[PDB]
Amino acid sequence: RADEISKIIRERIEGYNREVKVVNTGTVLQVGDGIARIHGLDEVMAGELVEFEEGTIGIALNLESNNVGVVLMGDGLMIQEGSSVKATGRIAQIPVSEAYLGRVINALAKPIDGRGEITASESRLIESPAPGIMSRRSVYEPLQTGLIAIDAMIPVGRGQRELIIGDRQTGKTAVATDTILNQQGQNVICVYVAIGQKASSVAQVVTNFQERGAMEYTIVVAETADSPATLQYLAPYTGAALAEYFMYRERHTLIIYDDLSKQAQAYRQMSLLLRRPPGREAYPGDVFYLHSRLLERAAKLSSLLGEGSMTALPIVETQAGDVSAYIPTNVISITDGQIFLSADLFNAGIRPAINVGISVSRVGSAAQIKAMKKVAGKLKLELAQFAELEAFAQFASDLDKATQNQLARGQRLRELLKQPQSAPLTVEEQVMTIYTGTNGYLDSLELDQVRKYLVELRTYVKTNKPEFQEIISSTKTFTEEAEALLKEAIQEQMERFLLQ
Amino acid sequence: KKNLGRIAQIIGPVLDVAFPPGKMPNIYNALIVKGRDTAGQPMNVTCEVQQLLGNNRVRAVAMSATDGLTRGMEVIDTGAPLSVPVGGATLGRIFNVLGEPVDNLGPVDTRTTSPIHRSAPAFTQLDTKLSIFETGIKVVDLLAPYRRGGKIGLFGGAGVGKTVLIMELINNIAKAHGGVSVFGGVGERTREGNDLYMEMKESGVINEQNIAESKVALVYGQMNEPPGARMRVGLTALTMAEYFRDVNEQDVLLFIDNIFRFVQAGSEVSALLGRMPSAVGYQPTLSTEMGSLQERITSTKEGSITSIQAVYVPADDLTDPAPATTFAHLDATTVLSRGLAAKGIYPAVDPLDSTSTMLQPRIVGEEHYEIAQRVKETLQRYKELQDIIAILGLDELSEEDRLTVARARKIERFLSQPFFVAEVFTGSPGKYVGLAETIRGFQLILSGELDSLPEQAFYLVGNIDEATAKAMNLEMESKL
């Protein structure tokens, strides 16, 4: 093999024979700390990534008259202000295949884990027209986010682009990871793009996926901080081009972006460098157009296209817990609803910190299964009543028994809501939990022991009444046999829990 | 090299130089300007190319003072991206951003110089071992543990802490860590740099007798330097630390003070440079520059660069771009608050806002995690009852919630600490208290077992036993 390795070289050496094509080639006027205002490229389509003499590929966005202002997808230190830069007929595409499953990549779709090099003959263009209204359909089936808070009072159906928006450090990344970690029994290919997050946090998330075993089906498109502005700009579109392939080939998916505020910050960078006029908050002209273009390509396709569904789940980090700022209100206008992770509810022990109020979901109960459609109705009603009676939380001084019982049941219901870190609640468990909480069956216990009682009850049920599994997984309606089985199981577990 | 420059324009700290067409330096390439001084002929002021304007001239920020530079002065490009001397020789000396000794000792050797603006470490090699760290502080060892070999942020208002805390943290750790520490005075005030140099040389860290032995290697690009200098002294500290993590195979502890200067100086140069202004007034490439500093600080299987950047929140605008971009990079952030300093509770660390991703239970210990959760919840309940207390009187709330209020007062006063370096401000000696001791203190405080002690008996106290002793002292002083 000592010379057979070089004999393999002869294959491609004799293969490539170089017909004479036209390469749009112009000189570089100006390298602008991330942008290279190259000159002379006339017949270059807006978006053709150019390649320099030093192999520093960059996209050509700002096509002015006498200088096409390209932005560099690499560290452009080696450009020499005169090195003839050539164009490429590529329109910023990426290769896509099934073998990306599990290997973290950058925006170039080049594997950054290093444990392989994914092969692909099919390529989906990174920017692409979103599903038309002839192809898009309404949201039927739910995406089990594993959380009682974001699967009972506010659902997320497959195809609906909910919004995990909240204060700094409230659990947005942890809730998105809880969703991706629950999505194990189902068949969704969960693409988790990380924009601007530090390298160590992406390492922690990928090693968490590999520890939980949910990394078999998860393309964590990773953009480190020192990665240039263009890649932190392009990462959502790269993950979207992967999940769009996986959706168009009939597989439901779940693309979870990270820090769309950081994505818009990278677009702010590259535009303000490219000298494009800034709007509000100095964000450029087309921020709303941008976020829509990568965020409205996420929905349920029709039957004649393949039944697939890309269910986006962005993460918009808003500071000081507000929606008045430019990016949060824009992405709220784009997204079908939102969930508010509030730092106050976070520090007050309610984990996940899902605000039970203003965090509306546009789909509503059309996404939830029949069991949730029956139980989470009473859950939402009782949480609304408990939030109305949140003012009488301590001042309930021997008041009317309706008020007292309702307030105590609400106080217990919020400790139903709160749940441990990265703990996925498969629907078969959370239906019984929300039932036990909303039908007073745990009014006897104090505020503290609801968590222990419910964990022990879920264990005992899932180990000793496996017919509930068949009913909830297959029939998916809270019928009479399941109801009676759950009541009897609750009674037996409450007895042995009193026996401690 | 030899490529003479002929500086064309000098608009403030940003000077652009019209090179010949064929021989043009690359970006981030040092440009020593052979220019005259105020008195005398020889003077070498350094400049790094920031962008190539394309009229055969390149824009370069100035590392020394821009006064004294002539339109038409000869200047050569080094061809090397502003090399900085590192190795065994950088131990013990205060360094400029240029890479020179500022302590007027014997000059360093150029045997092991290193480029200052290099590529980030690839994700293929990233050491991620989650191990808690015992700094010495009650609150930020309990309420917000620090990640050993991981970035840590001392956010805060102007003068709430974040430099006395940096001084105490270096005073604690720089002796314990076998690997050296690389303190970076990025745009810090000079007199605090003087205090830190004196405190290091008195605490045996510098060891002035044997300067080649020190476990610290300072770089000062302090407050009174041209905006080029504060833009890159952080990168100088990073280059020394990256050498000590790439070659010497030892875990190093870099303290950068006021990393916000690394963004504000970037603002003052980006204004003149031709780059358009971003939000509230910073540079456009705030996030990419901040990442270009922060990403190079990673435990990379050869060592572990633990780092504590004393981020400056501009007037406690906790939503401003300069802290908003650094919150994403900083693992064990620690927001110090002027609100909890105006009432004298020092350190001014917020119990709620200061949070760390090392407060996961399987990483930090189950009982410690539970105590941290209970303390944070009690403080959150107090912050939510601050409106009822302030307006409707302390009495108008419940009598269990009153116990929670008094318990929150006890906790938020108990998490005060007498630092060794803050004895000149307190007047009382400092008490270094471990992690398990503060856990055992908080357990008895919030378990309701000792809700009888006066509130001042928990103020500025090392341990719960010292608090019990101060209760006796105060009860005797009350009647006496």
Partner: peptide
């Protein structure tokens, strides 16, 4: 934001 955030806190 030290002006807007204070007023948001006061309105809350």
């Amino acid at each position: 934001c030290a002006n807007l955030r204070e007023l948001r806190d006061r309105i809350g």
